[PDB]
Design a protein around this nucleic acid. Structure first.
Lengths: 50, 96, 75, 64
RNA sequence: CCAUAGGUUAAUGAGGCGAACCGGGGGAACUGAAACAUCUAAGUACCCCGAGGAAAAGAAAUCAACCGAGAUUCCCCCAG
RNA sequence: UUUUGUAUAAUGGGUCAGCGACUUAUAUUCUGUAGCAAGGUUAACCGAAUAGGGGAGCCGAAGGGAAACCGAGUCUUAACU
RNA sequence: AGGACCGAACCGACUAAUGUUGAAAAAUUAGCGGAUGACUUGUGGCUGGGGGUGAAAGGCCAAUCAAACCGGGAGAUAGCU
RNA sequence: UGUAACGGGGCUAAACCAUGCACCGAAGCUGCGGCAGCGACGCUUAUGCGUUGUUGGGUAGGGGAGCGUUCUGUAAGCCUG
RNA sequence: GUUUAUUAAAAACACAGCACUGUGCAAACACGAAAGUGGACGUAUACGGUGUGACGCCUGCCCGGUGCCGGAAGGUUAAU
RNA sequence: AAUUCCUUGUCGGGUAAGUUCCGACCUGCACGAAUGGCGUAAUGAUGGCCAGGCUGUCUCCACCCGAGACUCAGUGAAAUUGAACUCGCUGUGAAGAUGCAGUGUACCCGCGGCAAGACGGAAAGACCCCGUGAACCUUUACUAUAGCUUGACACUGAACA
RNA sequence: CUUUAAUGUUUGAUGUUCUAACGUUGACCCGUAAUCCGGGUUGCGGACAGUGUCUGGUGGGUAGUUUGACUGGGGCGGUCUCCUCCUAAAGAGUAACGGAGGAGCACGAAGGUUGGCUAAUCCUGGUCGGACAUCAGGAGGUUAGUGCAAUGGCAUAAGCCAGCUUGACUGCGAGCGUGACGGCGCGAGCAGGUGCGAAAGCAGGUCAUAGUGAUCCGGUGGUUCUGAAUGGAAGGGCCAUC
């Protein structure tokens, strides 16, 4: 519905991204989640609420 | 491949891959041959001459697939591990 | 105004009492916890009860609420 | 004549060592962020064509 | 005006027919796609021009691949 | 003949006689059978010409992988109980 | 004088009956309309198929017309009989 | 349309109820004779029998085994004025 | 008057008359790959198209929609 | 009203009696002004209604004259047709029986005649439905295209402001 | 460099004028005893018109086609996928244009964990204060709640509140369930790295069951896997994803 799709990109040098959905209207703030990076193999901070 | 009008099996499944261009010029030599090469020396020619790989073939490989007996000198062909041991065990010589 | 129903979900008891199971086997695919998990039985996310060790299925009635457990006897 | 291969079937099935055919799983091209990673991880390896369907496949692929 | 157009005469050749094969100029649709329009049928049917006992093509501004082959045409593979 | 079901008042046939409908070619798969057998077999063509040559090729003896590549293993994966 | 009036030839075809395996694949008999006109007729010519021609009915184009006839594509196709 | 709601005659039992013993009754079962399929089993061994058990309705359809026709070889043979 | 030759002759078609509209002549328009031809050896009192349909009394309001005619400022807008 | 469903509207005229006809009213389902409105003399093998005359149209048919029909001689078809030793009823039955069951009736064979049945004959129902059938027709369905139309380049230049 | 002034020069733009291309279905002459045509002279028009290629617009004038199925005949109406209950005959499944309802999402907390807590309603007392807003006590028992239908669940709470958080992880997966298949679902455990907790442990989303779309074609990021002489590249593959 209204809830958009975003890419959580990795803070390490890799291009690896998780992908998910955000309500852009009610939460306009960016979304930072310490997720797992399998190219670095380490839990790195992910950014970019699209 | 007509299932009534349902989307057929060869058309509801995705397609994968590509064709190599290079696997059509590689070959795969057993050890049952190379007693057939007339010489005790094995190159791409000496195999082509023995009607065993084909004229278009550029790469060849000497897979363990059974029972080398005579001492054979393999030249310029890739040899697998097990068949390196089998060629070198029955006299034999592998240079590249 | 009517004429619709969902597809039948095929719930129920898949392995009955005394029936020998392997580990991992689903015993009761069900909807709440009509049957609860007992010894060597796990309860999945959709309240599917599955054999966590090998053995025999044991339906029992335990506890102060007369709940229907499902154990597995080691066999 | 000589039998023509159903050509878009050759791009989708590949013959194996004992005559069965492997194929890539469906459902893993797009709409993907809605799917669990357990689905997607179980759809990546290639799979054998089942018993029902080998008749159709062998009919479409007579040289492979 | 010179001259060209035109006119008259003579010499040589052509014209038309013919079954298929051949080269070229044009060129469908039914059909198949379980509908249909891209696609197919198919450069097929047909129409037209021209030629020969055959025609056409043909003597690398061609391939190949760091080795080489050596014009065109036809057949069997390559290879569904 | 078609049908759930035809004496059916459902279809067909006035009768006789003659003709009248699962073929042919080329590929592929399985069964039988024959030859040879880790090998089998040639096509075009040459031709004393159904012989004999012709093994170009095709199929099989090795798979895995999208592919490079590896190879009785291989792919997945950083690595696999 | 008159797309004037009555009415034969001439052109037509309103009604009825017969006929309907007819005398006739459209007629006969008894009445009927026009009958100097936008009439009728002979002989020749011209227009052609998505085309002609049409005082228009989808009428007519060789007893064929919401697309002639012949030949070909062609054994079109027919999940239907 | 005609009795026309026992098939009919006809029945006061030839109706109904209860009990019992008879008999009729099918391509069922049995008897006698025959053929064929599938098993098992001692030989026969390349199969037949002293056997022996059991099976044999059949549409779509699958499997197996045959007869006839015309033509070629056997056949310049063998029948035939 | 004409029409469904062969089940419909009619209120239908036609018609004189009316109106609208196009057309300045190498006319519009039509047949025609084109040449050309008809329009017409005519010239706007003519010709083509469309509707209505002798005559008499008349033909009212609506330009928002669709079309046509006219305008060129601005927006958008192809090949290049 | 060629227009009006309700509707045989209501009133009037004609008729013994009038769903039609004529006149009128107007509540015009759903007239109406050049897809013309309303009148309209004459005309019409035009539509509707009334009357005089006339009559076999009819009450209700009768007789007669001819041509067939019928008999004889000659010639000599056709559609149809599984086979027939081809009755009624009542019931059964693929549900409307010459063929089944029960029963009743009926010597065998023709000729003239009638047409109730043989789901009679003729024509692979024209209606209805179906077919991923066809054809023509329409349109602001889709896709094209002829035609008309727009600009660029070509054919296609100079001399001055 | 910025900004300006004069000249020369280099090119485009526009308007007037011109004759020389082209048009002439104007006149005259000739081929020619010819209203065709061609040539000549001249007049008029004249870079226009016209035609070719390209291009926008218009285009039933014409052509090719499409215009669903279910359906107690077809049309009209309704429906078409997914979830819940009943029908459904005490395993599963089970039809009808049978009876009833819902979905085409929401959520970065409404997920994970740790620690804690327990509802509805009614009665009584009490400032504004009321049938019903807060307080206190009692009865009561989950008649409540569960992000949204219904069913099954839920107190060990799956309900309610707070602290810290990202396991809403990545690669796999014994074994099962469920479908004709495509597919869908459940999953202990293994490896890597993480959160909460003192720890045992729990966490691969949410109490569960709806919240959806195959393939092709193509877009974006990563990975030399390929890369038609060779080195690259383009394109393709693979992984993620739209």
């Amino acid at each position: 519905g209204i809830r958009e799709k975003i890419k959580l990109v990795s803070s390490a040098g890799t291009g690896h991204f998780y992908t998910t959905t955000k309500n852009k209207r009610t939460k306009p703030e960016k979304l930072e989640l310490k997720k797992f990076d399998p190219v670095v193999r380490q839990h790195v901070i992910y950014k970019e609420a699209k | 491949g007509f299932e009534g009008g349902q989307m057929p099996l060869y058309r509801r499944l995705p397609k994968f891959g590509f064709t190599s261009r290079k696997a059509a010029i590689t070959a795969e030599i057993r050890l049952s041959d190379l007693a057939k090469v007339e010489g005790g020396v094995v190159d791409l020619n000496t195999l082509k001459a023995a009607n065993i790989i084909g004229i278009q073939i550029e790469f060849a490989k000497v897979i363990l697939a059974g029972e080398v007996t005579t001492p054979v000198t393999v030249r310029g062909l890739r040899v697998t591990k097990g068949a390196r041991a089998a060629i070198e065990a029955a006299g034999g010589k592998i240079e590249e | 105004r009517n004429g619709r129903d969902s597809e039948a979900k095929r719930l129920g008891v898949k392995r009955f009492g005394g029936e020998s199971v392997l580990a991992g086997s689903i015993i009761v695919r069900q909807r709440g916890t009509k049957f609860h998990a007992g010894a060597n039985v796990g309860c999945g996310r959709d309240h599917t009860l599955f054999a966590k060790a090998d053995g025999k299925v044991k339906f029992e009635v335990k506890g102060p609420k007369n709940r229907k457990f499902i154990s597995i006897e080691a066999e | 004549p000589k039998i023509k291969t159903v050509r878009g079937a050759a791009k989708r099935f590949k013959k194996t060592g004992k005559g069965g055919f492997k194929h890539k799983h469906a459902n893993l091209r797009h709409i993907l962020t809605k799917k669990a990673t357990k689905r997607k991880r179980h759809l990546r390896p290639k799979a054998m064509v089942s018993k029902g369907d080998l008749g159709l496949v062998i009919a479409c692929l007579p040289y492979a």
